[PDB]
Amino acid sequence: ATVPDLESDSFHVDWYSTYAELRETAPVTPVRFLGQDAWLVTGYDEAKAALSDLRLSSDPKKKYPGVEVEFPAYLGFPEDVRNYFATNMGTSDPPTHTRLRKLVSQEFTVRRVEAMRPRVEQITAELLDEVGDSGVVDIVDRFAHPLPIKVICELLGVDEAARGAFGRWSSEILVMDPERAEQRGQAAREVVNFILDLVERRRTEPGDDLLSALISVQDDDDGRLSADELTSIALVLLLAGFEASVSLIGIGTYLLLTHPDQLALVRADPSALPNAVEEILRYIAPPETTTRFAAEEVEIGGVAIPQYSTVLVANGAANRDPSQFPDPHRFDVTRDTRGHLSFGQGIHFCMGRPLAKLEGEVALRALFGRFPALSLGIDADDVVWRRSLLLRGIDHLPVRLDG
Ligand code: HEM
Ligand SMILES: Nc1cc2ccccc2c2ccccc12
Numbered sequence: 001a002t003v004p005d006l007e008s009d010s011f012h013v014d015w016y017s018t019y020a021e022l023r024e025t026a027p028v029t030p031v032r033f034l035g036q037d038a039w040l041v042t043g044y045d046e047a048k049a050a051l052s053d054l055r056l057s058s059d060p061k062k063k064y065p066g067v068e069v070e071f072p073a074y075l076g077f078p079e080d081v082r083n084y085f086a087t088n089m090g091t092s093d094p095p096t097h098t099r100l101r102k103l104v105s106q107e108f109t110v111r112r113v114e115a116m117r118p119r120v121e122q123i124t125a126e127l128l129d130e131v132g133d134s135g136v137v138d139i140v141d142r143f144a145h146p147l148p149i150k151v152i153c154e155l156l157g158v159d160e161a162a163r164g165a166f167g168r169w170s171s172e173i174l175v176m177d178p179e180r181a182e183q184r185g186q187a188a189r190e191v192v193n194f195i196l197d198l199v200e201r202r203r204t205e206p207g208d209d210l211l212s213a214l215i216s217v218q219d220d221d222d223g224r225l226s227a228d229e230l231t232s233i234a235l236v237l238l239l240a241g242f243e244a245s246v247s248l249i250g251i252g253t254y255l256l257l258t259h260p261d262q263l264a265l266v267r268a269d270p271s272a273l274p275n276a277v278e279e280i281l282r283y284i285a286p287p288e289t290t291t292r293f294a295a296e297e298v299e300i301g302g303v304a305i306p307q308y309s310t311v312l313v314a315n316g317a318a319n320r321d322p323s324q325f326p327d328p329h330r331f332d333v334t335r336d337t338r339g340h341l342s343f344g345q346g347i348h349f350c351m352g353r354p355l356a357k358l359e360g361e362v363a364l365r366a367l368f369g370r371f372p373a374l375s376l377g378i379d380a381d382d383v384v385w386r387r388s389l390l391l392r393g394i395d396h397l398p399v400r401l402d403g
């Protein structure tokens with residue numbers, strides 16, 4: 001048959017329609033992406049099973065005989081910077097993942113996150129106070145973008161002076177263009193340098209932030225975090241922790257604005273926002289696809305995936321599986337969102353889930369409440385989507401504040 005290319009517009013224009021078509025052809029199909037053959041999983045059952053089957057590694061630095069592990073996400077990154085991006089929990093298999101996650105979960109506690117709420121509401125308040133009450137504004141550059149950035153930067157004790165710039169660095173990191181590869185390798189290097197310097201400043205100037213906390217964590221038999229592991233933990237938390245949240249807010253803002261029916265519900269019932277945040281994740285999952293490597297020949301949904309293959313688990317596609325989520329195309333704030341694969345599934349489940357939801361709820365509530373007549377300042381079908389299978393989102397969302 002025809003091997004679909006993941007670069008084609010079909011996967012970037014009304015893409016939830018092509019997914020559903022492939023999912024109906026074969027839930028597990030071979031594909032071409034970035035110049036490598038891979039397997040795309042677009043079925044719910046298949047995706048869940050895949051995230052649970054541990055023969056599929058999340059480790060890109062594992063060497064095997066006569067083969068080269070190349071996770072698409074690392075398009076362009078020189079080896080030394082790849083290792084810096086891949087020496088944490090999200091890119092490690094047990095037992096290392098096990099000790100890495102245990103040491104971090106010790107400080108990255110629900111307590112710490114709950115003690116943040118007040119500042120999160122304060123930061124949220126300050127931003128909206130600076131927009132005014134009239135005209136059109138880019139809700140991304142003015143709200144959805146800085147809020148998450150101020151939050152995680154405060155969490156990791158980022159020096160606000162020598163802060164910023166990475167915002168441009170991560171923008172470039174989130175798109176995998178086979179030609180801008182060098183620009184992608186250069187951005188990645190910059191990020192790694194900011195972090196290396198960040199921790200050293202932290203190593204020298206203690207504080208009671210999560211990062212200084214991680215620098216002093218220790219355990220009986222599990223041990224403590226080494227330099228490389230620590231610098232990598234900090235990087236992933238700061239990057240995957242702010243960008244993914246930005247998508248939550250922007251997408252979430254767009255969605256309600258275009259589904260007045262749902263906005264009214266959220267607006268009347270307060271207890272409806274926690275669930276509204278969940279349907280947002282389900283409907284347009286930021287982590288469009290997740291990557292695994294077949295360390296052994298695996299069988300997914302009757303299909304035998306050859307050993308040493310690159311498996312791309314399309315979380316976003318799995319969320320729209322009709323046999324698991326009835327009428328997957330109706331954005332419904334009342335729906336049962338239980339079982340969606342946006343925070344992951346299995347052992348690599350998102351550690352930051354409670355901080356993510358803390359932001360989603362606090363942000364959206366403040367926005368729609370202080371601006372009861374908030375409107376989308378552009379044709380809905382004109383909203384530009386980010387061509388990223390790595391992290392989907394909106395980079396410019398113009399809204400009118402007063403009317
Ligand atoms: C809208 C919010 C977010 C979404 C949708 C999200 C999604 C995910 C996904 C899909 C994974 C699993 C990756 C895989 O299976 O390969 C994951 C892992 C992780 N997330 Fe998030 N995440 C979000 C926010 C955060 C935040 C705010 C932080 C931290 C500040 C964070 C930290 C982590 C960490 C440490 C992991 C790796 C855990 C592991 O692999 O054991 N996430 N997240
Ligand atoms: N929070 C996240 C952490 C990750 C850690 C390792 C690899 C991917 C992700 C990831 C991928 C898409 C969305 C969010 C995340």
Ligand SMILES: Nc1cc2ccccc2c2ccccc12
Nearest residue numbers: 073074085173236239240390391
């Ligand atoms: N921790 C992450 C590392 C990455 C490294 C290279 C490319 C993308 C990501 C990425 C993309 C989305 C979320 C997290 C990450």
